[PDB]
Structures are given as structure tokens and as C-alpha cells.
């Protein structure tokens with residue numbers, strides 16, 4: 020049993036830092052913005068084991084054969100924005116629309132991820148706005164931090180698996 024998950028969002032919001040924290044349990048700062056890898060691990064979620072196949076998307080400018088196949092065959096999406104980056108929040112609508120267009124569905128497993136909440140002196144998008152926008156798309160909302168010690172990183176990926184299993 021494999022779940023194919025896709026992490027999407029504007030550049031610089033922490034998709035790589037979240038994915039690396041989830042798989043390798045380390046915080047990698049300033050990770051190369053252009054590397055797009057997928058990662059697989061065998062893990063236990065609610066006493067049910069599964070292989071998690073996670074694509075860390077990078078560089079939506081040019082065509083990515085990797086991203087094309089994961090977007091088409093993916094089982095769930097994490098939509099990440101940074102609470103310190105207003106534009107990454109505003110583009111949540113674009114990613115949401117794109118996922119439903121590719122899947123040709125009125126709804127699909129996704130979770131809205133508000134990252135970098137450890138940066139309390141820089142926070143621009145309030146928790147209210149985030150919950151508002153998740154409510155608007157009728158998807159779950161979770162706040163995360165990839166910096167040690169990490170906040171809700173495992174829970175974000177596991178909750179997406181839970182959404183997929185509860186269809």
C-alpha cells in the first residue's frame with residue numbers, strides 16, 4: 020500500500036524543509052531552491068503501515084516530467100504557504116484550482132499548511148486568515164514549523180493520509 024503525496028506552494032515557503040524534516044528528521048536551512056526529488060519511506064499511521072511516496076516540487080517555470088506524473092497520479096496534496104509571505108498566501112487559490120483542474124474533480128484530498136510559525140516577529144498572515152481560507156475551500160488547516168524542534172510536520176503528512184483513507 021503506497022500513498023503518493025505532492026507538496027506544492029510558492030518558492031521559499033518551506034516545501035523542502037518540511038519534506039526533509041519529515042523524512043530525514045533534520046532541519047536543512049536555505050536548501051537549493053531548484054532540486055526536485057521524491058522520497059519514499061515505510062511507516063505506521065494509526066497502526067496501518069504504508070509506503071509514503073512524496074514529491075517535493077520545485078521550479079514551476081519549466082516542464083517537469085516528475086511533477087507531471089505525480090500531479091496526475093497523486094493521491095493527496097499539501098498546499099504550503101509561509102505565514103511571513105503574503106503573496107504565497109494569496110496564491111493558495113491558484114494551487115487549489117490547479118489541483119482540481121488536473122484531477123477533474125469538485126474536491127480532492129488536500130491540507131492547507133501554514134508554515135514558519137516559529138518566526139513570531141515576522142508573521143504577516145494571521146491564524147484567522149488561514150482558517151478563513153481553509154474554511155472557504157472546505158479543507159483542513161494546520162500550522163507547521165520545519166525548524167528544530169519541528170511542529171506538526173509528521174501530523175501534516177499523516178493527516179493527509181487520514182483524509183485519503185477516509186474518502
Ligand SMILES: Nc1nc2c(ncn2[C@@H]2O[C@H](COP(=O)(O)OP(=O)(O)O)[C@@H](O)[C@H]2O)c(=O)[nH]1
Nearest residue numbers: 030031032033034035036048049135164165166
Ligand atoms: N524559521 C523557519 N525557516 C524556514 C522554515 N521552513 C523553511 N525555512 C527557511 O525558508 C527558506 C525557504 O525554505 P525551502 O525549504 O527552501 O522552501 P521551498 O522553496 O518551498 O522548498 C529557507 O531559507 C529555509 O531555511 C520554518 O519552518 N521556519
Ligand SMILES: [Mg+2]
Nearest residue numbers: 035051052077
Ligand atoms: Mg525546495
Ligand SMILES: [Mg+2]
Nearest residue numbers: 044045046167
Ligand atoms: Mg532531529
